[PDB]
């Protein structure tokens, strides 16, 4: 019932479940935290910005890797108007045989990609599932830099 | 071990084990005292 809202002693003394709920919803309101100065505020915001950019780059790297690994980017290059892009494969134990058959695309059940990443990456000059892997590797390196 | 075994190795791992340990840690942390 203590020590969770480390940034707020008023919440940490709450004997109810409201402390847990308000601890989540006030975690990023740095200006309202206990023992707070402006320098610490700007420094924490700066570090949070770095972590956020790292998260964005990791998300993009994950999209690239999953298109390279479980997608049909190379097949879509040769026939972009008939082949439907694949986002990533599906492994869900709750599937029946009918669901597996219906979601089956090429070798495994997979989700069609509605993000338009296939067309975007094709336009900027990507033609191989090894070009996407290089992008994922580089973006994970950039995320490490930002962290 | 082929690459197609990775989903069956990772999806249960992440989607069940990570919730369990994360719940353990979060409950322990939010139920601490001083």
């Amino acid at each position: 019932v203590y020590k969770f809202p480390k940034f707020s002693k008023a919440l940490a003394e709450d004997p109810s479940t409201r402390r847990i709920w308000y601890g989540i919803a006030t975690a990023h309101d740095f200006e309202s935290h206990d023992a707070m100065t402006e320098s610490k505020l700007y420094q924490k915001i700066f570090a949070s910005h770095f972590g956020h950019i790292a998260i964005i780059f990791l998300w993009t790297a994950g999209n690239l890797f999953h298109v390279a690994w479980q997608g049909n980017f190379e097949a879509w290059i040769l026939n972009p108007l008939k082949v439907r892009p694949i986002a990533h494969a599906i492994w869900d134990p709750h599937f029946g045989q009918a669901a597996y058959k219906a979601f089956l695309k090429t070798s495994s059940p997979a989700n069609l990609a509605l993000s338009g990443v296939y067309e975007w990456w094709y336009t900027i000059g990507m033609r191989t599932n090894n070009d996407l892997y290089q992008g994922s590797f580089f973006l994970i390196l950039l995320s490490s830099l930002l962290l | 071990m082929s690459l197609d075994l990775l989903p069956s190795f990772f999806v249960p791992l992440v989607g069940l084990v990570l919730p369990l340990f994360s719940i353990i840690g979060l409950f322990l942390y939010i139920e601490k005292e001083n």
């Binding site: 480390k6 949070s48 790292a54 990791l58 390279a68 599932n129 892997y133 490490s144 962290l147 | -």
Partner: peptide
């Protein structure tokens, strides 16, 4: 089709990015 080595080293590099993330997470304090 990417190889096992390609996926494995990407997983290893992802682990390194994870240790860098907790270091940033712990440095942003409890």
């Amino acid at each position: 089709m990417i190889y096992d080595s390609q996926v494995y080293i990407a997983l290893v590099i992802a682990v390194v990015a994870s240790v860098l993330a907790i270091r940033l997470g712990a440095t942003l304090y409890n």
